Amino acid sequence: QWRAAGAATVLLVIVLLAGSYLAVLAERGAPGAQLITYPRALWWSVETATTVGYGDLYPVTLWGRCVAVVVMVAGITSFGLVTAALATWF
Amino acid sequence: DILLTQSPAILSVSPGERVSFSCRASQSIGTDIHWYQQRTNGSPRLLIKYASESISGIPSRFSGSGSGTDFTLSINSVESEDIANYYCQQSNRWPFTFGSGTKLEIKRADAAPTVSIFPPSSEQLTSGGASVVCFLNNFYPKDINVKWKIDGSERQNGVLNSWTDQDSKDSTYSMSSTLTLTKDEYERHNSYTCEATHKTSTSPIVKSFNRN
């Protein structure tokens, strides 16, 4: 079960990628939007999931914000578990 | 939206000299600037990406620098093939936008025009039309005048001229001058002459031919 929660890692990487793709898709078309290219969108996602939120990038559209919210929870839940498991096996 | 200012619109340099094109963004765009080259009648071609990244296939001669609001595209030792229009483009914010472009002009040594005159073809005459064509090729500077004379008398009607852009092959210019007349009008005249007056000579360069 310990490394079975390590499956959250699987989920997270998927949400991060989908998030990045979806983020760009939602943001382009929004005048001034900066989250409009995949690479950095991918960086934005980690920045967001880890909840570090630097401010160098963020969504300005409604769906962009929705994708963001999903990524945030994914991150929080995911890291929650990996921490709880590392706490168990030690 | 981000405004990209490219000034000056035209840059004149001597052969083998280093040149720098300027691109200023209305707001900071990090290094999200890309440069394209577009030769006369050609499609745009990517030269540099993200302000300074090289593109495979592009001569080492090309390089870029800058970040924030001010960017530069540089060419070490310019050569004829670099004659073209250069555009910057940003991808920091939506929508992507283009600068207005800068043309590269090369100041080479003066060259007298090579003049050639051609009688209308038999295939054309067969259609009741007659075009006399004159080429003033590979000269520099581009300032030049052409004059037509039929039987020793200056002619102006029926003449249409066309000038090429600076040539990316040798930095020269060329011009064509076409005198179009009906087969009849053409049949009642003997000699046709084209005269070119260019800075390289105090006397005109003339080419003629008789219909017979």
Next chain:
Amino acid sequence: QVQLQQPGAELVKPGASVKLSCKASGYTFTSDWIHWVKQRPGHGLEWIGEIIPSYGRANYNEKIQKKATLTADKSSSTAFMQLSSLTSEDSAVYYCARERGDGYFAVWGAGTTVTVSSAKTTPPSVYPLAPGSAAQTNSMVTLGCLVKGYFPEPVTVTWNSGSLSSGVHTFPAVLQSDLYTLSSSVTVPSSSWPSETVTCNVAHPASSTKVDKKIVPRD
């Protein structure tokens, strides 16, 4: 191989609409965006819009009146731009370009010249330009071909099917009485002609025609 293929030209009567195409080849990714750029003669590049084939969503330049509608066919890897209710202001070269979702246009199509006019299409007449009998030849000789009475632009002129590029000048066309005319110049060593053949190839996209004219010395 050519990554983006676009038709050479399209003639459209004022008020009518036209659908431009862009056939793509080479690697294709779900992150690719196809862009369209407009360029009027003597002017700069203007961004029109973009579309992501994998999803089908399109975005447009808000600063300009919307004349285009973008679509894409995944099975044929072709992107389309429907331009409607055109006026002479819409006459220009329209390029399609591919962006890998990373901000720059990696490659561009050759562009489609769109002409908005009521005039009718007309293939060009190609005439030879050989020196007169009294012309003195140097170590080089200049030949050419006259291309007149065609509409609309453009025409592509090559020498010896393209094998001859050096020493070639094609002059900008001049418009007179709803018809264009231009000449192309070619210079080869005087000794090689007529021993070695010299032919110009004139293609006129709008009329789907391409003719050849061998240049031989006058009778």
